[PDB]
Amino acid sequence: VSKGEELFTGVVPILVELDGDVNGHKFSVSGEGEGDATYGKLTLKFICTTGKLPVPWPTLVTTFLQCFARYPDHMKQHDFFKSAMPEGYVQERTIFFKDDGNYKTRAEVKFEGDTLVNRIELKGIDFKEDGNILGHKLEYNGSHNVYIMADKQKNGIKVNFKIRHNIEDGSVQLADHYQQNTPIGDGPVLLPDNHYLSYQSALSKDPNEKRDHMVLLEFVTAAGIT
């Protein structure tokens, strides 16, 4: 097993730091938790440290650690994420909210000692002040697939997927995701055959937490290659 892989055989502490600006509404979020890739398990708690989060927490779920996905033994040569560790990779995304604005994110995911860290910058523009996002019309508790393909030319991967956030009136707010990952190091990485990650997610609250926050539990499993 490679250095990349063996770095995830046990429980790994996680730290996330995000700075955002959506239509001029600036905010910061700190996250802590742990990942157990053996079980594709993520347990996290995010806290808005600047007061009230100006966007719905559900819209930040996908932004808030694919290196913790459980890759079946027979699919191990297709795990790009762990292969780039500990040096890490840069994840870039554009998330288009149908009939509203878009988020553009840049995240540097890598190890700092024994801690897996993700430093994120989020920029949102063209949002409607009273739309489903800035107007907070999305339900908090709104199995889904994330499609991965190799991008040989850029020595990384290209990822695409759609999320449908539940609107309070019963409708749905589509969030179309376009993602790219590129290694930070100059070392070797695994370029995968087409496959996907299956997500199970659940949002909750900490009963003793007064700050605006989100408790997020996820189970991520690679599939698509039999």
Residue numbers in the entry: 1 to 64, 68 to 145, 150 to 233
Task: Share the article's original sentences.
Fluorescent proteins share a common structure composed of an eleven-stranded β-barrel containing a chromophore that is spontaneously formed through cyclization of a tri-peptide sequence following the central α-helix. We here used yellow fluorescent protein (YFP), which is a GFP variant that has a chromophore composed of the GFP chromophore and the phenol group of Tyr203. Insertion of a few glycine residues between Asn144 and Tyr145 enhanced the pressure dependency of the fluorescent intensity of YFP. To summarize, though further investigation of the mechanism underlying the amino acid insertions remain to be investigated, we found that glycine insertions causes the new static water interaction to the chromophore, which can enhance the sensitivity of fluorescent protein to the hydrostatic pressure.
